[PDB]
Design a protein around this ligand. Structure first.
Ligand SMILES: Nc1ncnc2c1ncn2[C@@H]1O[C@H](COP(=O)(O)NP(=O)(O)O)[C@@H](O)[C@H]1O
Ligand SMILES: Nc1ncnc2c1ncn2[C@@H]1O[C@H](COP(=O)(O)NP(=O)(O)O)[C@@H](O)[C@H]1O
Ligand SMILES: [Cl-]
Ligand SMILES: [Cl-]
Ligand SMILES: [Cl-]
Ligand SMILES: [Mg+2]
Ligand SMILES: [Mg+2]
Lengths: 360, 360
C-alpha cells in the first residue's frame, strides 16, 4: 500500500467523451506543496458522464464500473466535470450530482470529497500546471514562455504566460503561486469548439471526408483539406472571433515552446500520421491529412486501416487542428508543436493535485 | 379496438430530444391511399434514442417505457430516427439497431416492420406531407404555394414547391405523386442547425441571454436579440451558406403560405410570447424576445415564470429563429408564419402513413 507512506488522492476527469479515474501518490515539500507525484491506479470508462441518462440505475452502473478493482481503500475522491457538463443548465447538472452523491453515500470503499463542474478557466489552469509539472518547469523561474493547448471534445483551452492586464477580463487571467514563485497566466476555454461539438457543423461537407465517404445527407465525400480548413476557420473566426481574441495577446506575449494534449496526441501517434520526436508542425499535419486521408478512396482506405475508429474523421480533424492553431491562434504553420504521448495518460488532473482552489 | 375495422400502424418519431410513438388508424381510397387518418394513441419519452448508451440494458428500459400502457397490440411498427442518429457514423448506429431488433424479436405485442435512420430529405418530404394532410391540400391541385419548415433539435428542414430544375441536385428535388396528382418539391435539411446543436456554439455569448444570467464561463448575460441574431447569422451564412443555397430559389418560387412545426410552436405558444391565430411574424418574434426576455433581469424574470424549463433559452431561440428564417431563407420580417399548435401532436410521422417509400 503506497498510501500508508505517501499522501494519496483520487481525481476523476469527467470529460466530454469519457471519465478517467487516477489515484495519485505524492510527498510534500516544506510548504506542503506536492512533489514526487506518481499515478498508481487508473481506469477509464466511456461515454461521457454528462451524456448518459441522469437516473439512479444508469449512474449506479457507470460509477460502479469506473470505480471497481482498485487495490486501496478509503481514498478521498475529487470528481471534476468539464465542458460536456457545462453545455447543460445548472438544474440539469444538479440531477447528476444529486444521484452521484447518493451513490457515494451507499458505499464504503471511496470517500467523496467534491463533485462539481469546473470552469473552463479552472480547466485551462490545470492543463498548464499538468504539462509544466511533467516538464519540470514549475520549481524555478523560467526564461522561456511555455504555452499549452488542450484539444478536448466539447471545449478547447489555450493558456500561456501574460503579465496582469487591466484591460482584459479577470476571468481570463490567473495569478498562480506555485513552489514559492508567482506566475501570471492568460487562460481561455472555447465552449463548442471541442472536436465533437465542432464536427456536428461539418458532417455534410464533402471537403472534410475521404472520397466517396457516405455523408449523412446522401452525398459523397470529396476531400480537400485546405477547403475543409477554410470552412472550420469560418466557425473559428466569423462565429467565435478566436483570432481577434487571441492573436493580439500572443503578438505581445510570444510563446517560445508549445505543448498540446487531448485528441491531437492520439491523431498524431496513430498509424495514419507520421511524426518524429512526439512533435508536429501544422504545415505537415495538413499536408498528411490531405494526402493520406482526404484524397483517398474511402472503401480502399478503410479496408487498409480497419482498426482505428477515428479514421473516418482524420481529414476533418487534421483540417480543424490547423484552422484552430494557425487561423484562430495565429501560430506559424512551421512552428513546432510538441504533443504529449497518449500512453503517459496525462490530463489536467495532475493540476488538481498541485492546486486545490477553483474560481469562486 | 378501432384496428378491427380500420388499418392501423404505429410510427415512432425517434427525434433528437425524444421519441414519440403514434398509433394511427385510417381507411383507404380506391388506389389504396390512406384517408381518414386519426391518431388513436400517443406516448412520448425523453431523452433522444441516439443519446443513450447503446447497450441491451438501457435500450430495453427505453423501449419498454415508450411502448407500455399502449391500449392496442398486434400492430406493425415503423421506427424512424432523425438527425440525432445522423450525427453518428453508420457503425455506431448499427449497435442501436441490432439491440432494438433483438428487443422486438424477444416479445410478441408489437410487430417490427422497419427500424432505420431516415435521411433529412425523407424527413423534409414527410414534414410537407404531414402539414398539407392536416390542411386538406393534397387531394386537389392547389393554386397557392405552401411551404413548410420543421424546427428540430439536430436539424432543420425547409420544403416548398419548385418545378423540376436540371441545375439542382436531384437529392434536393422530389416528385411526389399523391391522390393522383404530381407535385414537385424542393427539400433541404441542415444538419447541425437544429436548436440543441446550434445552441452549443453560443452559450457564452452575453447578447444571447437575459441580463445577469450566469454564463458557463463566469461572465454575465447582457441580452440583445438583434446582436444575438447577428451571431447566429454568422453560423447560418458564413459557415453553412444557407442564404446562398435557399434565397435564389425562393425569390423565383415564392411561397404564399408558410407553416412551421417543431420547437417554434412550443416557444410561440408559451407563457412568455403572445401571438394570435397560431401565427407570428419574424419582426414581432424578435421584438418580443428582445424586450420580454433579453433585456430583463434574469433572477427577476426566472422568479416570475418558474414553470418553463426553456425560459433561459428564449432570448437565444427567438434570435435564432429570426436568423434562420430572415437571414438564412430570406423570408420577409413582416411575413406571417403559421405554427401548428403543440397540442395537436403533429409531426412528420403522418407523412409515413401516406407515403412508405424512402430515398434509395
Ligand atoms: N485517435 C484520435 N484522434 C483524434 N481525437 C481523438 C482520438 N482519440 C480520442 N480523441 C479525442 O480526444 C478528445 C478528448 O476530449 P475529452 O477530455 O473527452 N473532452 P473535454 O471534456 O476535454 O471537452 C475527444 O474529442 C476524443 O474524441
Ligand atoms: N418551449 C419550447 N421552446 C422552444 N423549443 C422547444 C420547446 N419545447 C421543445 N422544443 C424543441 O423542439 C425541438 C424538437 O426537435 P426534435 O424532433 O426532438 N429534433 P430532430 O430529430 O427533429 O432534429 C427540440 O429542439 C426541442 O428542444
Ligand atoms: Cl444512458
Ligand atoms: Cl443529413
Ligand atoms: Cl465555459
Ligand atoms: Mg478533456
Ligand atoms: Mg423532429
Amino acid at each position: 500500500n503506497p498510501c500508508e507512506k505517501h499522501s494519496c488522492i483520487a481525481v476523476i476527469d469527467a470529460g466530454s467523451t469519457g471519465s478517467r479515474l487516477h489515484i495519485y501518490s505524492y510527498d510534500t515539500d516544506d510548504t506542503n506543496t506536492p512533489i514526487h507525484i506518481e499515478e498508481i491506479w487508473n481506469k477509464k470508462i466511456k461515454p461521457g458522464f454528462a451524456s448518459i441518462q441522469p437516473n439512479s440505475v444508469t449512474i449506479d452502473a457507470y460509477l460502479t464500473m469506473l470505480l471497481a478493482d482498485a487495490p486501496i481503500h478509503n481514498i478521498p475522491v475529487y470528481f471534476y466535470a468539464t465542458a460536456g457538463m457545462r453545455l447543460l443548465p445548472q438544474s440539469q447538472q444538479k440531477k447528476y450530482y444529486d444521484e452521484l452523491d447518493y451513490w457515494f453515500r451507499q458505499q464504503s470503499q471511496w470517500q467523496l470529497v467534491e463533485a462539481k463542474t469546473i470552469t473552463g478557466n479552472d480547466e485551462a489552469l490545470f492543463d498548464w500546471l499538468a504539462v509544466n509539472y511533467k516538464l519540470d518547469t514549475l520549481k524555478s523561474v523560467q526564461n522561456k514562455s511555455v504555452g499549452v493547448m488542450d484539444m478536448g471534445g466539447a471545449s478547447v483551452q489555450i493558456v500561456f504566460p501574460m503579465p496582469k492586464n487591466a484591460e482584459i477580463s479577470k476571468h481570463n487571467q490567473v495569478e498562480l503561486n506555485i513552489y514559492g514563485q508567482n506566475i501570471n497566466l492568460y487562460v481561455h476555454s472555447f465552449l463548442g469548439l471541442g472536436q465533437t461539438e465542432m464536427s456536428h457543423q461539418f458532417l455534410n461537407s464533402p471537403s472534410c471526408f475521404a472520397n466517396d465517404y457516405p455523408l449523412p445527407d446522401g452525398e459523397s465525400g470529396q476531400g480537400n483539406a485546405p477547403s475543409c480548413k477554410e470552412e472550420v476557420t469560418s466557425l473559428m473566426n466569423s462565429v467565435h472571433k478566436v483570432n481577434q481574441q487571441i492573436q493580439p495577446l500572443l503578438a505581445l506575449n510570444p510563446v517560445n515552446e508549445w505543448y498540446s494534449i487531448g485528441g491531437i496526441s492520439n491523431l498524431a501517434s496513430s498509424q495514419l500520421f507520421h511524426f518524429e520526436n512526439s512533435e508536429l508542425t501544422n504545415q505537415s499535419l495538413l499536408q498528411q491529412g490531405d494526402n493520406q486521408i482526404c484524397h483517398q478512396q474511402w472503401d480502399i482506405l478503410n479496408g487498409q486501416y480497419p482498426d482505428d475508429e477515428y479514421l473516418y474523421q482524420y481529414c476533418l480533424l487534421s483540417s480543424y487542428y490547423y484552422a484552430l492553431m494557425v487561423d484562430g491562434y495565429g501560430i506559424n504553420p512551421n512552428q513546432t508543436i510538441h504533443y504529449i504521448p497518449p500512453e503517459q495518460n496525462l490530463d489536467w488532473t495532475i493540476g488538481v493535485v498541485l492546486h486545490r482552489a477553483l474560481e469562486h
